Design a protein around this nucleic acid. Structure first.
Lengths: 71, 63, 145, 141, 80, 107, 141, 67, 206
RNA sequence: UUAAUUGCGAUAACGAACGAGACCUUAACCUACUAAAUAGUGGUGCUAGCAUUUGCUGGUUAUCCACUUCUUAGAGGGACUAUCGGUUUCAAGCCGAUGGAAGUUUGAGGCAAUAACAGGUCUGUGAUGCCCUUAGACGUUCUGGGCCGCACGCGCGCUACACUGACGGAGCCAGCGAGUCUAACCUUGGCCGAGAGGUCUUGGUAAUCUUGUGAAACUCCGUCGUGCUGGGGAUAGAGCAUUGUAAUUAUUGCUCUUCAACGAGGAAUUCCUAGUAAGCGCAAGUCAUCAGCUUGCGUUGAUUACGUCCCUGCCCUUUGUACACAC
RNA sequence: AAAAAUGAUGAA
């Protein structure tokens, strides 16, 4: 029975803003298994980070999103 | 290095109770004068290159 | 994106209509834990209580939770269609009711006992425990019916 | 009047009719640009007749395609065959066949069904099963 | 009345009509004629009428309580 | 009164292609042999009437199925001609198995 | 150049014309929105509670533009999908007629479609006008 | 398989024994000639007879054929 | 390259595809090569295709599928659960996504990674059942190159599907990790460990 | 040697017949013929709409003029394993490549010998022998019930166990059909209704209208997020409709609510080799209503093998037999 | 060169 954070508090959010810039391949399942968060927050986090531009998209598709580090 | 490359120069026929194996004659690539008979699983052509893990056993169950 | 950083006011599993409503499931599908409210009823109650649909039950405040409870308990005066309800034109007072958490089993028992007391065929079949809606019983329903 | 040809492409039961004529460079499918053909995963299937021979010999013609029948994939294949055969017919009728044969070699070297319709046809279902070959499940006790 | 009209026409080569031969042999059998005599008479008549081949099958309890089939043929017949 | 127009249509329905085309050709040749401008015999799509049934009268055996079919072939010929010759083409170009019905129209 | 609403992607146009109607606020939504589930074959109401009627109106308007004239039964067949029938196999089920009828009446009120004596509702002068300008805007966004 | 039956074989033999000077090595004109020099009920059978007649003519060119 | 001005506007990404045929206009078949002799001209990467969807006829002859593009054969083996029969559009979308993920995870050519995985996951020796007795037996035999590529593709897609079942990971992601591990030899990949298992059983039954 | 008692041949047999093949139907080709307002296409052709160098449209033989690529159907053509190479002992044939719409008998069917089976059907028949019954009828009708009943065992199936997914919105494409005056059949459109449905009209006895049957899988964008969870929808409660003289033992449809087993299934065992398996729906039969069934049809479309006689069987020959009700 | 037993009475 996996437990995943469904609400984002400060520690999880700062862990996002630090660990995620390091990941070379970034996606929903990557955030979900390497940061213990639900798919809904994972999708929101990917959409959040893309607007600032610290991850960039290679392929935007429903049911599979492809992001890498910004450069 | 236990990898031997051998080229099928002749297809002999089908073997196995259910016909699934094929008798072939292959010649070695390192020396093109040493030919051996092997049992092969899948579909084979002349000039197909096989990978022999061991390279001394003669094929049994002929026809 | 609804990126939220909300302070330590989150509430886990909570009690509405003496029922255990989880606080991690989205409000609409979390309300469906209560007997008598399904996905349609929960969607309509939440959307007529004007809560954000993209919210977990845990960050709904108590006053909007009680608005939800009032809407659920007395739906007919909140502009609900009424054809959307659980117990319309009942056999006793002819009122359009929606049976809820602990009342579902008691009103079911009432219908059962009414049929068995009047010794209608459906009530007799219920008394035997067999299928009542006319299904064949030769092959299916063996392990428990 | 204006030089023109009319061709057709055919997948299983889809049929596309292409009107090719001396024009400007317009490529249309059901009145819409070929850039909006669906599915987008198969849009390059209808791009193939253009890219194999080059757009510099599409820049003086306009093609209009109307496709009916079949399904979403079959209509795409019919569209690509109609476009390729329309180009071949136009070069047959108003350009040299040295160019025609150049086009045909390019198309047939890349893919045979650009010019020749696939001859595969559905097999009628037979009684005793759901399909042409498969039978209902057989029991013995 | 006046919109239905019937004519009767004589059948040329009566020996080539299977319906007429079967009806005639039925009446022969109903008059007590033997099965072999009737069947062979029908076959001979049909073959004398110019047919390429003829066949008469008589099935049922011809002799005893147990049924059987008798088959009388001449000429050549096709099947497929 | 002076060679009036009719805009007549003759339709031919049958289950026999040979006899159907025979009567259709007789009508057509009568049109040319009266030097008449027409729309030629338009052949409609063939109607295949299917009946699919079990072969057995009981329900024993392997479940075998037959498909019988009638085939209906229909043609129509548009014409315009005087009455004195539309009547004679009504009373001729007929034979069994082909039914003909004739409709006055403005097509 | 020459721009019609055929040079723009379907979903793109749909979402843009829907947003246009959302800003304009003239459609006069029926009132029973957010209680209905849009189809007897559906299981849930539209997830976009505050924009699904405008999405439907944009889709219907584009459909009318594409065709000659279309009626309520054809919208019901178009937007209907397959219905889950429990332990029974699926089948196509027509969509709710009241929603489509009131979409058509709302477009008549805003002057997008008219009575089409040969049929149901067809595109108007002003309907072509606005849908074509918004399509040009979506292309040169 | 593509084995010709005795109908095709015997018809081709009769054609060669009757019309050898008229026959040739080309299937197209042999096909054309078969319609005038024989009555074959079906076009498929005529095609098979003509193609076995030309096959036998090709055999006859490089030496005699028994039968 | 002086893009052609055209009444129907073609975007530059499609204009550049005129120069050479490019898989999804991203991945080139040029310089991709089978690095395992005996598998050349059975892993076909010589004729370029724009997309892994063509309605080719590779089933009517014995060895005709050897000319089928290896990406399309990999796609064709993704159309396999019973619930996914057909659905080549879905399979091609999965292939495109996993190729993108492979190129992001490892800065190599995705087609080259796929080819190396296939060459690394084909068993060289196997066993066949023998003996009409009561106790049967397995006799070691060698594997033809076509069967090697066939079974490599089968193992790669079967492992990707079994690992994508009932987990948060997408099928494209799982297929990418399977191909990436198999392209170097990991023994954490289903196809590699099945290949080693078959070869070890063959050696034991030699 | 062939799919073939198909042929080459061999020959105490010679010449024949049936079956196989041939044949017929259907599918695929024809820019070649004959045409078509019940099929289409083109004409700064007519008229008019929208957006500006002109594209997309609406009415077009009833508002015209041409044409037959697509559609239709008559007459035909086309493949005969053609050409080339190899191989067999020449031969019958076989293999490969080329060309070709098509090169497995081009694909699929229809038809299909002799001799049989105590195979099924007397419940299709005004086909039927014999026996039984024949007015308190086993005849024929009416009302009601039953055929569906439930500790249990088996066969054909449907729905599922989910993220290669569920749900929502949007996109958006078939083919095979069928349909009323010997009356209420197929129904567009308008209005009302949340739905199912109701109502006023309309077209169609039909390439004309339903219908482009805008089918469903499918595609895109979004919500869900590995939780028996928004998977699955069994069971049960309440209400609203339709068909019918009659719906209770729920005809069926619709709305809300309850939300079971099931996490891929032991021994076992079925079907299948290319537009095939499998997925997906649609029409017809049944039919007042009821399709989880069948007969067809199309949409999407794999893997694997082009083999063997191991299992289960089939054909021919030789051989043994104490079998002939025939292991 | 693994294992493989049995099959009620009469019946053109």
């Amino acid at each position: 029975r996996a437990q995943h954070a469904v609400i984002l508090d400060q520690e999880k959010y700062d862990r996002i803003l630090k660990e995620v810039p390091t990941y070379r391949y970034v996606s929903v399942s990557v955030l979900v298994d390497r940061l213990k968060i639900g798919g809904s927050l994972a999708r929101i986090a990917l959409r959040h980070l893309e607007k600032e531009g610290i991850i960039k998209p290679i392929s935007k598709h429903s049911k599979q999103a492809i992001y890498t580090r910004a450069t | 290095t236990p990898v031997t490359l051998a080229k099928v120069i002749k297809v002999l026929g089908r073997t196995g109770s259910r016909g699934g194996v094929t008798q072939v004659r292959v010649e070695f690539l390192e020396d093109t004068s040493r030919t051996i008979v092997r049992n092969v699983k899948g579909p084979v052509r002349e000039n197909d290159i096989l990978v022999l893990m061991e390279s001394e056993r003669e094929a049994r169950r002929l026809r | 994106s609804l990126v939220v950083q909300e302070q330590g006011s989150f509430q886990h599993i909570l009690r509405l209509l003496n029922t255990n409503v989880d606080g991690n499931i989205k409000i609409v599908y979390a309300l469906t834990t209560i007997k008598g409210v399904g996905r349609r009823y929960s969607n309509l109650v939440c959307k007529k209580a004007d809560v954000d649909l993209h919210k977990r039950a845990g960050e709904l405040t108590q006053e909007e939770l009680e608005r939800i409870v009032q809407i659920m308990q007395n739906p007919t005066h909140y502009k609900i269609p009424a054809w959307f309800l659980n117990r319309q034109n009942d056999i006793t007072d002819g009122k359009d009711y929606h049976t809820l958490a602990n009342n579902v089993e008691s009103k079911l028992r009432d219908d059962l006992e009414r049929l068995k007391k009047i010794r209608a065929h459906r009530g007799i079949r219920h008394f035997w425990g067999l299928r009542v809606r006319g299904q064949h019983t030769k092959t299916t329903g063996r392990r428990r019916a | 009047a204006v030089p023109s040809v009319q061709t057709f492409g055919k997948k299983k039961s889809a049929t596309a009719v292409a009107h090719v004529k001396a024009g400007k460079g317009l490529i249309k499918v059901n009145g819409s640009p070929i850039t909006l053909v669906e599915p987008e995963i198969l849009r390059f299937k209808v791009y193939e007749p253009l890219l194999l021979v080059g757009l510099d010999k599409f820049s003086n013609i306009d093609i209009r395609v109307r496709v009916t029948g079949g399904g979403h994939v079959s209509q795409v294949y019919a569209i690509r065959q109609a476009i390729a055969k329309g180009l071949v017919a136009y070069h047959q009728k108003y350009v040299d066949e040295q160019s025609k044969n150049e086009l045909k070699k390019a198309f047939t070297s890349y893919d045979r069904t650009l010019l020749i319709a696939d001859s595969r046809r559905p097999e009628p279902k037979k009684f005793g099963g759901k399909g042409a070959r498969s039978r209902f499940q057989k029991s013995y006790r | 009345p006046g919109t239905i009209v019937l004519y009767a026409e004589r059948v040329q080569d009566r020996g080539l009509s299977a319906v007429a031969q079967a009806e005639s042999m039925k009446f022969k059998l109903l008059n007590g004629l033997a099965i072999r005599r009737a069947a062979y008479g029908v076959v001979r008549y049909v073959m004398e009428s110019g047919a390429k081949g003829c066949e008469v099958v008589v099935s049922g309890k011809l002799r005893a309580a147990r049924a059987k089939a008798m088959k009388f043929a001449d000429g050549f017949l096709i099947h497929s | 009164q002076q060679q009036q127009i009719i805009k007549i249509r003759i339709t031919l329905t049958s289950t026999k292609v040979k006899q159907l085309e025979n009567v259709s050709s007789n009508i057509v040749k009568n049109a040319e042999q009266h030097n008449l401008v027409k729309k030629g015999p338009v052949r409609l799509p063939t109607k295949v009437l299917k009946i699919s049934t079990r072969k057995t009268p009981n329900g024993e055996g392997s479940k075998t199925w037959e498909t019988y079919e009638m085939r209906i072939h229909k043609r129509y010929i548009d014409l315009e001609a005087p009455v004195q010759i539309v009547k004679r083409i009504t009373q001729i170009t007929i034979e069994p198995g082909v039914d003909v019905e004739v409709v006055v129209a403005s097509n | 150049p020459g721009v019609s609403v055929r040079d723009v992607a379907a979903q793109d146009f749909i979402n843009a014309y829907a947003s246009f109607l959302q800003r304009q606020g003239k459609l006069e939504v029926p009132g029973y929105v957010d209680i209905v589930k849009t189809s007897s074959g559906n299981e849930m109401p539209p997830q976009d509670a505050e924009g699904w009627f405008y999405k439907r109106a944009a889709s219907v308007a584009r459909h009318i533009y594409m065709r000659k004239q279309v009626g309520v039964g054809k919208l019901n067949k178009l937007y209907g999908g397959a219905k889950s029938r429990g332990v029974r196999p699926y089948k196509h089920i027509d969509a709710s007629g009241s929603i489509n009828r009131k979409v058509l009446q709302a477009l008549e009120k805003i002057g997008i479609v008219e009575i089409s004596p040969k049929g149901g509702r067809r595109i108007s002068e002003n309907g072509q006008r606005d849908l074509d300008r918004i399509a040009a805007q979506t292309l040169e966004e | 398989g593509r084995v010709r039956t005795k109908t095709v074989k015997r018809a081709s033999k009769a054609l060669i024994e009757r019309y050898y000077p008229k026959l040739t090595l080309d299937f197209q004109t042999n096909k054309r000639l078969c319609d005038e020099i024989a009555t074959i009920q079906s076009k498929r059978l005529r095609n098979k007879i003509a193609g076995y007649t030309t096959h036998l003519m090709k055999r006859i060119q490089k030496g005699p054929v028994r039968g | 390259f002086t893009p052609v001005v055209l009444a129907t506007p073609i975007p530059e990404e499609v204009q550049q595809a005129q120069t050479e045929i490019k898989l999804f206009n991203k991945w080139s078949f040029e310089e991709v090569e089978v690095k395992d002799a005996s598998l050349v001209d059975y892993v076909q990467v010589r004729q370029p295709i724009f997309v892994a969807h063509t309605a080719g006829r590779y089933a009517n002859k014995r060895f005709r599928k050897a000319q089928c593009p290896i990406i399309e054969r990999l796609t064709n083996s993704l159309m396999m659960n019973g619930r996914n029969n057909g659905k080549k559009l879905k399979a091609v979308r999965i292939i495109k996504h996993t190729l993108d993920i492979i190129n992001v995870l490892t800065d190599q050519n995705p087609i080259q990674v796929v080819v190396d995985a296939i060459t690394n996951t084909g068993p060289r020796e196997d066993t066949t059942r023998v003996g009409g007795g009561g106790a049967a037996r397995r006799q070691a035999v060698d594997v033809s190159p076509l069967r090697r590529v066939n079974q490599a593709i089968a193992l790669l897609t079967i492992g990707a599907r079994e690992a994508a079942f009932r987990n948060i990971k997408t099928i494209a992601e799982t297929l990418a990790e399977e191909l990436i591990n198999a392209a170097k030899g990991s023994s954490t990949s289903y196809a590699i460990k099945k290949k080693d298992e078959l070869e070890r059983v063959a050696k034991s039954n030699r």
